Amino acid sequence: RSYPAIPRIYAETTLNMLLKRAKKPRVHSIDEYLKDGGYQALEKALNMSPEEIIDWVDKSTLRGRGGAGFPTGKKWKFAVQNPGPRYFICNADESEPGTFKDRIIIERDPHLLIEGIIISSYAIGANEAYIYIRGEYPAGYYILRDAIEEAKKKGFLGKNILGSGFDLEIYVARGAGAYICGEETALIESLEGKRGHPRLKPPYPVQKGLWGKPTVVNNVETIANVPFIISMGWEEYRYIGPSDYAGPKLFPVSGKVKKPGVYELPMNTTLREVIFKYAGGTLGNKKVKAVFSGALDCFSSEELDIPMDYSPLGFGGTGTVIVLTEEDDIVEAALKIAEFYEHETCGQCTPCRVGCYEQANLLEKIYKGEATEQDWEGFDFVNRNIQPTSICGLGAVAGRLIRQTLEKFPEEWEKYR
Amino acid sequence: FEFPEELKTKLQEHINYFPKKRQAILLCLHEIQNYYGYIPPESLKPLADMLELPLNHVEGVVAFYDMFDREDKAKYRIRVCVSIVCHLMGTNKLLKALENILGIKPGEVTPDGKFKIVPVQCLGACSEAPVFMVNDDEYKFESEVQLNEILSRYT
Ligand SMILES: NC(=O)c1ccc[n+]([C@@H]2O[C@H](COP(=O)([O-])OP(=O)(O)OC[C@H]3O[C@@H](n4cnc5c(N)ncnc54)[C@H](O)[C@@H]3O)[C@@H](O)[C@H]2O)c1
Ligand SMILES: Cc1cc2nc3c(=O)[nH]c(=O)nc-3n(C[C@H](O)[C@H](O)[C@H](O)COP(=O)(O)O)c2cc1C
Ligand code: SF4
Ligand code: FES
């Protein structure tokens, strides 16, 4: 009944789907959930074949909400071609700077998440499912354990769910300070009781995941879309937003905005609209210097008119919007991104291990005026050579945003030389 | 070394929760840090036995995960976010206020073993920057007077 204190993050929706309840900053229990027609998509899904469900999710055009945007129906198809037992995992690791969209679903509408997990589990024929939540979300952990007990009590979990013959247990696991555990293979290793070290892919988890068995890993926000897909049908779900990037999308907006929070909008929305039409514009009406797409991209004030979709000229990522204004030093900002990667490399890969450490160590020297001409030249080189031999996406991106700032704001960088 | 029945039951509860005992390592460690206010080195051998894992395994895990500290004992762990958004919104003002109130800087513990400042990466509450946690409880920093009232709730 009494959970740890959690900040009341502002949430706003134009679609009233993923945020229908989670727009209110409080735990919505099972009776409140059922009252809104909750768990009725589950009832409908149990009457359908697991294959029908996969087909509906494919046709809905739902793409992964955990940053890479892979087609979900397709991912489920890949797993089902290899024999069972199969495992379903909810990625609730959310450790990306500026990303706090998944936590409001967990903490405020846990049953929306649970419901998606059960439909998704039934779809791939997983009789065992996991929620891997980060250790810095203890309230979300207790909210989920309590809600899982509520669903088990109402007969949505256990053996022979609602007389369908489908069995399911959802287990809740906790991370412990490792960003890399959000990477699916490192997450699986951590579920097995080991260190969060990513495995070499291929094999992809759908072939060999948890206990070497076919495993589907999906993000909190992705799963939360599944009860909506089943309830309204794929056709009517495809009506939301543009037809090429359809469905609701959560955008966590922070930094130098008047109204920081999570916004549920269609993916046809421009970055400009997100900042000025929805987040109420910049704090103090200062001009936007840049926008950081998590610890991944940097968008100058010249690129605000781009769509918030999965297109090549689109914003992409998790739709994380960190707004920087004219008085914010880009080199001071880039140092904070470098520090993040230095702190998060698992160290398996030598160029990632040394590259992430060196980029932050040298950039700090740049900022504090301790930089020699060789530290400057070495910084540039190390920033371009973190990716070689890397087996996971971390090494591949560690220098991406920092490279972008160098190319987009040379003046501010040259002042430090 | 023997865990009190208060903690031993909780550990078995976590160990019997997942299909395999070894999967409960992170949950067990979290419970060990909650009880002792750190990870005692002596507690690693009994846990390795309960998990049916070798000692080297458990030691490697405690070392790998940042939420674990086998050095200092603190009743309250003030986790302070030092990432991009919190930095932009006033992490320095939060750390300066903390230093004025408790006399300690990040990485230090108060003389009474009550409070420890832990610099952490993004806590995923960036809209509420500057963010800090006091054990499991999470808050947005407004001011030293505000902060002072929050900290006073920790006895
Ligand atoms: N939401 C967050 O909190 C958060 C935090 C950090 C990073 N991320 C995101 O993570 C992304 C990088 O993730 P990634 O390296 O997992 O991406 P990826 O492109 O390699 O793969 C994404 C997904 O598709 C599946 N997949 C890809 N190719 C496949 C194939 N041929 N067969 C079967 N399955 C296949 C994978 O199993 C995985 O689940 C970044 O864009 C970043 O934004 C998100
Ligand atoms: C270093 C790293 C960290 C990641 N962290 C997360 C995370 O916190 N949450 C998440 O859902 N996906 C994260 N991902 C992406 C996952 O590996 C994976 O693609 C995703 O969970 C699959 O779900 P989706 O298809 O629904 O998007 C991370 C990837 C990398 C490379
Ligand atoms: S690229 Fe870096 S984070 Fe990824 S597996 Fe290699 S060492 Fe670990
Ligand atoms: S940057 Fe501090 S909570 Fe995200």
Residue numbers in the entry:
A (entry chain B): 2 to 418
B (entry chain A): 6 to 160
Per the authors:
Complex I couples the transfer of two electrons from NADH to ubiquinone (Q) with the translocation of four protons across the membrane. The L-shaped complex is structured into a peripheral arm that protrudes into the aqueous milieu and catalyzes electron transfer with one FMN and 8–10 iron–sulfur ([Fe–S]) clusters, and a membrane arm embedded in the lipid bilayer that mediates proton translocation. We have determined structures of the electron-input module of complex I from the hyperthermophilic bacterium Aquifex aeolicus, encompassing subunits NuoE and NuoF that contain the FMN cofactor, the [4Fe–4S] cluster N3, and the [2Fe–2S] cluster N1a, respectively, both in the air-oxidized and dithionite-reduced states at resolutions up to 1.8 Å. Here, we show that the redox state of N1a regulates NADH oxidation in complex I by inducing a conformational change close to the NADH-binding site.
However, when bound to the reduced enzyme, the NAD+ nicotinamide adopts a position closer to the tight position because the carbonyl group favors the position facing cluster N1a. This allows the nicotinamide to occupy the tight position although this is a non-productive state of the enzyme/substrate complex.
